[PDB]
Amino acid sequence: NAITDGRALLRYALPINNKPVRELQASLEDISAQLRANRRWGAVSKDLSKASRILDKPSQILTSVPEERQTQAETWINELKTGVVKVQELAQSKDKEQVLLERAKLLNLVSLIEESMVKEFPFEVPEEYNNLPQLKGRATIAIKTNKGDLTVVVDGYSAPVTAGNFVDLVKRGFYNGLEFTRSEESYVLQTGDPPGKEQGFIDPKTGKYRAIPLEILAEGDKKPTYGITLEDAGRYLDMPVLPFSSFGALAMARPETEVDGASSQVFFFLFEPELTPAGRNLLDGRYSVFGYLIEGRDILDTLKAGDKIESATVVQGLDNLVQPQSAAIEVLFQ
Ligand SMILES: [Ca+2]
């Protein structure tokens, strides 16, 4: 009764306001729930007919797309219409495997359309963090390990300071050669500890550890909560927009007693519903999730002692990374 697909969490975290595209999204999302037992084909066909009816009125979606991007979005709508027909044909033969494969392609198109609706960064990051790199949008990072590639999407719309720090460190090569750790009986896979005396990244402008604030956007808020756990904000019951209950959620480690003590140590949470008890965990609202694994699920589960990151690549979204601009408009006189 909770959303556990990281791609879906990321779609819902897009700061958009368009009810039709959300209905289209929900109808296509529902297909996987209906097909988990491979029995409820009527509900699948109802989902596809609803999706088709929404696509029949593209203007109700395109009205939220800025005029610069409307024509790419029209191509995506056309691809969705073609794909829905393809899936309706597959549903007629009750081909669960192909319906699910095509459903993922359709939802990727929905994601692309939804992301094109973000017009302008949704809030002002506190100026006290203007000395830190910030990701004003999404980025996709491919992490090459000795066991294969992990692809993560990091969400600067929900965690611009945290995602910005990560993309900046990736670009600096900080993670190259760093080992993974996973305690014996643990669902937490960690990396980002320099093998040396430092605990994180040293800011070359200051000569000191580049600490980042705790940054957690609570459901329904416009601005992230900075520097305080949701519990300490009096909001223990409120959930993050980017919650922990997805396999491969990527978050910042920090000392338990230092909310603003993170820098480079990160962890993946290998969430498993089957083994997770009913009730809240000790992670949501306390540690900042800033992205999700979207490819490499089987690889992630096998990472352990001795494994390491060989390299990390910014696949998409580098242009969303904003370096500190405080001294960028200063005029010198010699
Ligand atoms: Ca160290």
> What CATH number did the domain enclosing 50 receive?
1.20.120.290
Q: What's the CA-to-centroid distance between 210 and ligand 1, angstroms?
A: 14
Q: State whether 72 and 193 are in the same domain.
A: no
Instruction: State how far the Cα of 131 lies from the Cα of 322, in Å rounded to an integer.
Output: 10
Instruction: State how far the Cα of 243 lies from the Cα of 275, in Å rounded to an integer.
Output: 17
- Cβ pair 221, 138 in contact under 8 A: no
Domain span at residue 249 reads 127-318
- Cβ pair 65, 117 in contact under 8 A: yes
Q: What's the CA-to-centroid distance between 265 and ligand 1, angstroms?
A: 10
Amino acid letter, residue 245: S
Amino acid letter, residue 72: Q
Q: What's the CA-to-centroid distance between 92 and ligand 1, angstroms?
A: 58
3-state secondary structure of 322: strand
**Which is nearest to 23 in space by CA: 52, 4, 51, 1?**
51
- Cβ pair 326, 130 in contact under 8 A: yes
How many CB atoms are located within 10 Å of the residue 194 CB? 15
Q: What's the CA-to-centroid distance between 88 and ligand 1, angstroms?
A: 55
Q: Is 165 exposed, middle or buried (0-12, 13-18, 19+ CB in 10 A)?
A: buried
- Cβ pair 113, 78 in contact under 8 A: no
Instruction: State how far the Cα of 16 lies from the Cα of 5, in Å rounded to an integer.
Output: 19
Report helix, strand and coil shares of the chain as percent, to nearest 5.
35, 20, 45
Angle between helices 70-92 and 41-55 (to 10 degrees): 150
Q: What's the CA-to-centroid distance between 203 and ligand 1, angstroms?
A: 15
Maximum C-alpha span of the chain:
77
Q: What's the CA-to-centroid distance between 198 and ligand 1, angstroms?
A: 4
Is 194 marked within a binding site? yes
Count Cα neighbours of 112 within 13 Å in the Cβ-side half-sphere.
Answer: 18
Task: Give me the number of domains the chain comprises.
Answer: 2
Copy the structure tokens of residue 172.
């600096």
Q: State whether 136 and 264 are in the same domain.
A: yes
* Residue corresponding to tokens 């997770």: 276
Please give the helix or strand (H or E) that residue 191 lies within, else none. Answer: strand 188-191
Residue 6 DSSP class: H
**Which is nearest to 249 in space by CA: 153, 137, 159, 134?**
153
**Which is nearest to 282 in space by CA: 300, 256, 258?**
256
Amino acid letter, residue 123: F
The verdict on residue 141 lying in a domain is: yes
Q: What's the CA-to-centroid distance between 174 and ligand 1, angstroms?
A: 13
Q: State whether 111 and 133 are in the same domain.
A: no
Question: Hey, which residues does 209 pair with through a beta bridge?
Answer: 202
Residue 179 DSSP class: B
Is 198 marked within a binding site? yes
Instruction: State how far the Cα of 12 lies from the Cα of 244, in Å rounded to an integer.
Output: 15
- Cβ pair 310, 146 in contact under 8 A: yes
Q: State whether 270 and 300 are in the same domain.
A: yes
Q: State whether 71 and 194 are in the same domain.
A: no
Copy the structure tokens of residue 256.
């338990």
Instruction: State how far the Cα of 167 lies from the Cα of 152, in Å rounded to an integer.
Output: 11
Q: What's the CA-to-centroid distance between 254 and ligand 1, angstroms?
A: 13
Total residue count of the chain as it appears in this document: 334
Among the residues of the chain, which ranges form H helices? Answer: 6-13, 19-34, 41-55, 59-62, 70-92, 96-116, 160-172, 297-302
Experimental method, per PDB record:
X-ray
Q: What's the CA-to-centroid distance between 192 and ligand 1, angstroms?
A: 9
Q: What's the CA-to-centroid distance between 270 and ligand 1, angstroms?
A: 24
Resolution in A for the shown PDB structure? 1.1
196's CB contacts (< 8 A; 6+ apart) are none
Instruction: State how far the Cα of 171 lies from the Cα of 315, in Å rounded to an integer.
Output: 11
